[model samples]
Target chain A: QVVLTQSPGIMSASPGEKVTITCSASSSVSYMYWFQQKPGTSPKLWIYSTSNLASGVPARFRGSGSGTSYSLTISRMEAEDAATYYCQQRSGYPRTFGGGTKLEIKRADAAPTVSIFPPSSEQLTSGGASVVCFLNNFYPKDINVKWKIDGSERQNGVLNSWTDQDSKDSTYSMSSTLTLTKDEYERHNSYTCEATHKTSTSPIVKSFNR
Target chain B: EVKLEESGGGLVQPGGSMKLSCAASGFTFSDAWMDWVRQSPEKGLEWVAEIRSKVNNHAIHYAESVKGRFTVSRDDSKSSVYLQMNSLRAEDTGIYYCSGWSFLYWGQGTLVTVSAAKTTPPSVYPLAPSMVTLGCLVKGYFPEPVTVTWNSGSLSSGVHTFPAVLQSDLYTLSSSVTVPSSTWPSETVTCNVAHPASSTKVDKKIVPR
Candidate 1:
């Protein structure tokens, strides 16, 4: 099995700017093919057999590489070119696909507004308490959320929901919930929710005290 | 409206040979190239071969894995392409697909199964309860089309059977039957499994805790 590694898992550039995504194979391959996939459609081939442009592909898109390294370059990025690109190799027994590179149009990144909500009285009296961390108005759709109790990371009973993107503004919002038993909730002194996003220089942290 | 249809794939014995076909329509078959791709749950997707026809010449390509054992040909008069493979093995079991014009057009894949050396029976197990639901897991069976009955088909209304999943060249399937929570703990539910590959039928009984 040949493994293909793609660089810059996610990239953003302004329209009309040149963008290049590279794929490196673990071993020498006869050819590297590239595919572009939008959100709701199947992947469309952009480059085939290393450097030949596929039919119906834009002229600005080019493929170049040999041996173990290959690249797909766009002369000028267009708004419609915003999609995930994947590289595949067919030289070995088990063909493999690159993880994929998400290309986005440059925009003013939005930092998330983080808030922590303590468990309600009804929930606290029901033998279990659940704390929710809400994040809103974040751009680029990639964010990590972590829950900590007394400065120690907690993984059990933590549930994260799907992130939804606003169709009009393209911003993302999501929520994470942490459930604690009555005994665990009473013993914890403080709980914190940290959100890390590309727009923020440091993770935004919100805390709730018992 | 471009369409590609694949056919001629089925069970093949070890060391046997087989031929698969892809019929193209709504497009000029000779104007663009065609590619053959195969996928197995264990190995993922693999490119098998490709063929292109020109006015004076024909170009063909094959993956290194099947370089000598695979042959790709096309009949422009019939707007169809063919793939022939010799010396098959169990690992060659997969769904074979054909695509055209940079893969913009694809055929519904045709499943190709390479027969194993011997039949393997399923090992049944009782799964943990989901409230009032009783479940059973049937694992490690070959040459599929297994029949599962709940309580000798008497408890069929609330029974849900999942599709068989293939792993490591074997098949595993699961089924669950929902009973009243009050009576489930006292009820004895039997899961009957019948597979052509096995001589003995499996009757796994479960009693909720």
Candidate 2:
């Protein structure tokens, strides 16, 4: 019940810029911890009890505050530091998390626009067809692709996802293909291709059906 | 290395009271802060109350949701922290845990149910001294996610929402917006809470006196 409110829900900072996010507790607390969640990854503990940096944290990241007001400040932000930050309080029970502020770097590479291509007749004639999903023009290089039949996720996919360096732009392209028997496609099965990226709010989903 | 064990949970009726206990071992009781946390699958997790009991004295803080109805205390001689709630309502059913600052260790949660009476909490208060801002405090609505919206005669510029918080039995939510203080005194502030249990949004409006 110790309410913690965070300021500036989301923000943008360029490399070498300084950034600061704050958390205010409703009541006085002993101290706090800060967490950073990189795109496509679990949250990492960055600061412990206000000022003690966690293991492996860079010196540029610092936490400071006590009583009811606390802050997490990044000195000379790096591209790698573009991540969402959350604050957790320890002074009382039911430790709570702040709403989280997403720190983003202004970039030309937008989240990839995704599309799925149905299997061709030649492959369908050979008992199975390759269902291809194309991911085009995204930045940061780290992208994920997942396959599903109906609603359940599956590991059955021939993935050809790689960074396309020869493109006209610096952004990259990736693709994933799932093979299904012609009978399954004829039966009107639904296949889904999901793309996950750090900048995207939710997984980008594309579905294919006969 | 501190360990906590919670006990003493049972049924209660509306307007009745119930008390719970947390027994601690492994760490010196006087050197640590004891806290009580609770959760209902529908409402998520809530930190109820806590007490820092040193050999000399103790300080306590309770979630405003239970401000007047709940009491958090400690007994150093017994190395235990105590939580008491009066005027229990049906919405108070949930599992409660006891722990220190680091939740790595916690006591087995004790379940408390207010079976006979409705346990939902209600609303409160005014905007700040800046008078430019006002907040709506809504307490005790069932089933976790509650949407609390604020309205102030078409004020949209500084409107903000706080993170939702939970109590032992219900969820607590608040929303606020800033309007010209000169006009706010004449305008009515309304706090509306939308929840799974209620068909119509639970709303309350107050004219600042």
TM-score for each candidate, following the candidate numbering: 0.48, 0.37
Once model 2 is optimally superposed onto the true structure by TM-score, how far is the C-alpha of residue A78 displaced, in angstroms? 14
Query: Which candidate achieves the best TM-score against the true structure?
Result: 1
Question: What is candidate 1's CA lDDT for residue A36?
Answer: 81
lDDT, candidates in the order shown: 0.76, 0.67
Q: Which residue pairs does candidate 2 place in steric collision?
A: B43-B144, B90-B119, B91-B119
Q: Write model 2 residue lDDT over A49-109, tens digit each, in one string.
A: 8999887889999899989999999889987787778788866455687777778665565
User: Cα miss at A117, model 1 (Å)?
Assistant: 6.2
Q: What is candidate 2's CAPRI-style docking category based on DockQ?
A: incorrect
lDDT of 2 by residue, B88-167 (tens): 76666777777654443467677786665344544332323244545554444544345656662344444444444444
TM-score evaluated only on chain B, model 2: 0.52
Task: Give each prediction's DockQ, rounded to 2 decimals.
Answer: 0.07, 0.03
Could you tell me the TM-score of chain B in model 1?
0.66
The TM-score that candidate 2 achieves is: 0.37
Model 1 chain B worst lDDT run, 10 consecutive residues? B125-134
The lDDT, on a scale of 0 to 1, for candidate 2 is 0.67
Measured by DockQ, the strongest candidate is 1
